[PDB]
Amino acid sequence: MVDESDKKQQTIDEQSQISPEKQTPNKKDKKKEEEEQLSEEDAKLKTDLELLVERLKEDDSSLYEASLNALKESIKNSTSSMTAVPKPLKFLRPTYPDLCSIYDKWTDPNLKSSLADVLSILAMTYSENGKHDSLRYRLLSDVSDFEGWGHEYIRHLALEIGEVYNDQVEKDAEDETSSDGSKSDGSAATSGFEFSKEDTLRLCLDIVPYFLKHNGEEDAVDLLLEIESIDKLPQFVDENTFQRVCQYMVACVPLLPPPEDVAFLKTAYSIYLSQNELTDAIALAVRLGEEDMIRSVFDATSDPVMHKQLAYILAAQKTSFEYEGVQDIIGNGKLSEHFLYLAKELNLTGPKVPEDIYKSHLDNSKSVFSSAGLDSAQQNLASSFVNGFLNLGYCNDKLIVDNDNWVYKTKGDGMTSAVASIGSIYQWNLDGLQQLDKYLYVDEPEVKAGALLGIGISASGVHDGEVEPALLLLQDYVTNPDTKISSAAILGLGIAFAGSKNDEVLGLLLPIAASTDLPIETAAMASLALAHVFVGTCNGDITTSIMDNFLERTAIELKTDWVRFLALALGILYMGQGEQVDDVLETISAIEHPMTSAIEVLVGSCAYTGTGDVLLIQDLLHRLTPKNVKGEEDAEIKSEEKKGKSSDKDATTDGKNDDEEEEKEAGIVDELAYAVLGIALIALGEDIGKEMSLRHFGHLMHYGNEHIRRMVPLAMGIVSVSDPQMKVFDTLTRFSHDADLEVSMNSIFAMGLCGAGTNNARLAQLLRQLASYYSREQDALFITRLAQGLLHLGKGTMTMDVFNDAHVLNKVTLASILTTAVGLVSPSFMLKHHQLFYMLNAGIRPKFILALNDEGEPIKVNVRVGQAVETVGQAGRPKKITGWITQSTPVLLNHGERAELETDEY
């Protein structure tokens, strides 16, 4: 410690701990003496530096602070910061950390404030040489790590940081902002940013992500594209690069409103396309939703090879993943152009082969039938629906369908829903259509109408590739001047195709769904089908839907129910977008009826999703308003008002649901509590609002894919025996369906308890009966994610009919909708050129440890399992590939995605 003159190196380390005589007197006196001594100081600069390096290992603040205290003065006292500019500019190298020792390594608010400014200025000027960039570099990649630089070096980077952020907020902007007095433009600091970026990229990741977003421009991300794509293999592995790219997008979502967010995802797509994994390219291009990029990744495998090679099998798989099927239609027609075998390739791109593997899985699963049956009442109507509710997904129950007796013993609308549940027995299958034709060509038109709903459900398995399309059959029934037939026909068309876009389907629904001049309450089905068809792409928010909403208000305002169904359809049509939804929000609001305000608040949910942190408070101020106005005054109408109250509650939960999927993967945790307290607000406020909200609770859980499926629906159930409107129970089971007889062993009993136990009318009893069978399928036949799976961040297209039914009071008519249960996830099985219908092995991981990514990524440890497992849901979602050890290489990665597997054997 104490001085021990310069007689050995050990004592020079101690000499500068008390007071250097090599930097304090000498340099100071020299500089304020002759101006030809700059040739002496340049050598004595080197002497100064060594002492920093040696004392850039000593923890204590005092013997770095005090030793260099009078040097901090010399910056302005003797060196003057600039005189003969290069020499005094180059003598800031040792003095710059001196400024930091009082800025950072001591707190005196007066000296910290003033020297923030000074550090920023002298850093800006001294990075023109790039020797300030070199000064940062030796602390970035330290000499021998110690406390000091672990706090000081953050301050260097923060000067540039703050500045770029300040350029958006202020109206003074870079050197006219005096919080830094440095410019972010030029070729003096802009070259300092780039030079810093290369250095901090090599070993770490520090200011690199942070520069991009503070500019706000996709130009910034493209500057990094160049540097990284060289660094992709040699300076660090591909994998590390992939983690860099996705970490930028997923992290900054609440910092990227819709117009910013898409612009950032384009560059990400380009970095992948530069890199080897075309498997990464497809996932991100679907996220953008641009048809062009889908074709581009497909072309990347197709164009190079003049043969079928792994490349064409892989292209077909990449498009197969989307059960929306927007990809499927696109890739089928590229293949005809290229011309190889048609028979295997088009099917494989389409959802046909997914029919095939469901059969392989069914054979293992088995079939179970446990339905009740008693004649003559709502208890008979319930029983016949129940049999299909137990046979959801492709199951074998041929014989039960063949007995047409019970079909006829249902009456009125009951017949329609009876044939509709028959369709779900062969959901996603080429059969069914044979038994259905019987009803379609015989007795009352009601069974003919229910047949069309069942056609849609069965046609989910094949509609892309243009083999057995539902349109071909279903067009005639729309022409037919009967309302039951036409409304049922177009509802099945939307299920059948999916979010797939086809000209004949999409354009069929444009004439009608602008023909809302006709007063018809079952013409809602027109917009509901249209919404499901349209979503899957970055929406243009087509104008036929916008206009037909206005026309319907004009014709009728004494039928609030029809316009309530239709309102939901508008908001879901727009979902899959947030840019264009800002536009239509303002439009709806131009025309103002209190009936119109219902449409506005639902549409606000879609508009702001991507942050939805402004959205949630919006749907709470709205709650305040009715009561607010009444006090202010003091110091036919029926339908419009009833609509007003109901929409507001639906919207609030609706907002929560879109947000938690698009941004978070773990805030799903927080989202439950809002609903408990939110329903509690209403419980102790409007009784009318309570009716909607009970149902909404069940679908909040289902949409977000909450993690605890055991405790929550059941805990709610006991309360909901007392509360009116038993459709709450149906929505709870949508969530619990998860994997069957994992959650659902509790479910049947619990829903059976309130149904058998209580009697409060025979209208209520039906809904309770149905709920139990919906939940269970034999041996966990399938799982439902509302998410696309490919992206858990994606929102569904076929699962939106589950989402749809909570804003409306329960009726037999809504009971017809519920026979549909699509949203399905495929069971992943490894594939080959000859088509293997089983898996080999997989790894699954319940708990990650990574918080540098929202979900982390499964490390190479997982619990190993064998063949023949459906995709595992929450509490099992991270899924790793086990195929490496058998001398096979996966071509199609896995994370918990819906995607099928394919492998290549050496």
Partner 1 sequence: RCKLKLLRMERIKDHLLLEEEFVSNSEILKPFEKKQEEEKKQLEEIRGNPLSIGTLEEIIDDDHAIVTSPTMPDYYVSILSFVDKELLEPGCSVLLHHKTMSIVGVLQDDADPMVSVMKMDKSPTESYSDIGGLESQIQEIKESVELPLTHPELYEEMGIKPPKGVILYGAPGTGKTLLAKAVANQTSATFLRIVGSELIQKYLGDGPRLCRQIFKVAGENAPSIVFIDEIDAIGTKRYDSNSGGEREIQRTMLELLNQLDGFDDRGDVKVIMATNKIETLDPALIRPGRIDRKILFENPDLSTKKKILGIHTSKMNLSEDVNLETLVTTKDDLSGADIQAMCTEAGLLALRERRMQVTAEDFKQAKERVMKNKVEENLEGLYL
- How far apart are CB 589 and partner 1 at their closest, in Å? 24
Residue 174 or 662 with smaller CB distance to partner 1: 662
| Short-list 735, 842, 834, 857, CA closest to 785 | 735
- How far apart are CB 456 and partner 1 at their closest, in Å? 30
Residue 232 or 244 with smaller CB distance to partner 1: 244
- How far apart are CB 745 and partner 1 at their closest, in Å? 7
- How far apart are CB 250 and partner 1 at their closest, in Å? 8
| Short-list 468, 437, 463, CA closest to 450 | 437
Strand partners, 784: 824
Spacing of C-alpha 388 from chain mean position: 32
Residue 142 or 198 with smaller CB distance to partner 1: 142
Give the 3-state DSSP-derived string for 816-835, with helices as H, strands as E and coil as C. HHCCCCCCECCCCCCCCCCC
**DSSP string of 459-519?**
GGGS-SSSSS-HHHHHHHHHHSS-HHHHHHHHHHHHHHH-S---HHHHHHTTTTTS-TTS-
| Short-list 841, 851, 848, CA closest to 875 | 848
Q: Say what the alpha-carbon torsion angle 349, 352, 358, 360 is, to the nearest 10 degrees.
A: -90
Residue 165 or 674 with smaller CB distance to partner 1: 674
Residue 145 or 586 with smaller CB distance to partner 1: 145
Torsional sign, CA 181, 186, 191, 196 = positive
Residue 547 or 745 with smaller CB distance to partner 1: 745
- How far apart are CB 34 and partner 1 at their closest, in Å? 41
- How far apart are CB 861 and partner 1 at their closest, in Å? 5
- What is the per-residue burial (b if ≥16 Cβ within 10 Å, else e) of 805-818? bbbbebebebbbbb
470: which 2 tokens?
């539902």
Residue 234 or 304 with smaller CB distance to partner 1: 234
Pairing of strands 879-881, 888-890: unpaired
- How far apart are CB 670 and partner 1 at their closest, in Å? 4
Q: Which residues bind partner 1 (CB under 8 A)?
A: 57-60, 142, 144-147, 150, 205, 209, 247, 251-255, 613, 616-617, 620, 623-624, 627, 663-664, 666-667, 670-671, 673-674, 677-678, 680-681, 684-685, 687, 739-742, 745, 779-780, 846-847, 849, 851-852, 854, 859, 861, 863-864, 875-876
- How far apart are CB 666 and partner 1 at their closest, in Å? 7
Residue 19 or 243 with smaller CB distance to partner 1: 243
Segment (H or E) for 889: strand 888-890
Give the list of residues 6+ apart from residue 256 with CB closer than 8 angstroms, or none: 213, 264, 610
Count of other CB atoms within 10 angstroms of residue 206: 19
- How far apart are CB 297 and partner 1 at their closest, in Å? 28
Beta carbons of 653 and 604 less than 8 angstroms apart? no
Cα(509)–Cα(489) distance, integer angstroms = 11
Q: After which residues does the chain have a break in its backbone, defined as C to next N over 2.5 Å? A: 635
- How far apart are CB 664 and partner 1 at their closest, in Å? 6
Residue 305 or 620 with smaller CB distance to partner 1: 620
Cα(831)–Cα(823) distance, integer angstroms = 23
- How far apart are CB 276 and partner 1 at their closest, in Å? 24
Residue 623 or 727 with smaller CB distance to partner 1: 623
Residue 564 or 656 with smaller CB distance to partner 1: 656
Residue 6 or 145 with smaller CB distance to partner 1: 145
Residue 362 or 739 with smaller CB distance to partner 1: 739
- How far apart are CB 134 and partner 1 at their closest, in Å? 21
Q: Say what the alpha-carbon torsion angle 472, 474, 477, 483 is, to the nearest 10 degrees.
A: -150
- How far apart are CB 637 and partner 1 at their closest, in Å? 24
Cα(599)–Cα(534) distance, integer angstroms = 19
Exposure of 583 in the CB half-sphere (CA atoms within 13 A): 13
Beta carbons of 57 and 143 less than 8 angstroms apart? yes
Beta carbons of 497 and 466 less than 8 angstroms apart? no
Q: What are phi and psi for residue 481, nearest 5 degrees?
A: -80, 15
Residue 532 or 664 with smaller CB distance to partner 1: 664
Residue 186 or 254 with smaller CB distance to partner 1: 254
Count of other CB atoms within 10 angstroms of residue 863: 11
- How far apart are CB 616 and partner 1 at their closest, in Å? 5
Beta carbons of 212 and 256 less than 8 angstroms apart? no
Give the list of residues 6+ apart from residue 568 with CB closer than 8 angstroms, or none: 528, 602, 650, 804, 807
Residue 253 or 263 with smaller CB distance to partner 1: 253
Residue 208 or 771 with smaller CB distance to partner 1: 208
Cα(202)–Cα(213) distance, integer angstroms = 20
- How far apart are CB 395 and partner 1 at their closest, in Å? 17
Cα(518)–Cα(554) distance, integer angstroms = 11
- Side chain identity at 347, as an amino acid letter? N
Q: Rg of the Cα trace of the chain?
A: 34
Cα(283)–Cα(264) distance, integer angstroms = 15
Residue 490 or 694 with smaller CB distance to partner 1: 694
- How far apart are CB 213 and partner 1 at their closest, in Å? 9
- How far apart are CB 220 and partner 1 at their closest, in Å? 16
**DSSP string of 350-385?**
TTHHHHHHHHHHHHHH---------SSSHHHHHHHH
Cα(227)–Cα(245) distance, integer angstroms = 13
- How far apart are CB 440 and partner 1 at their closest, in Å? 38
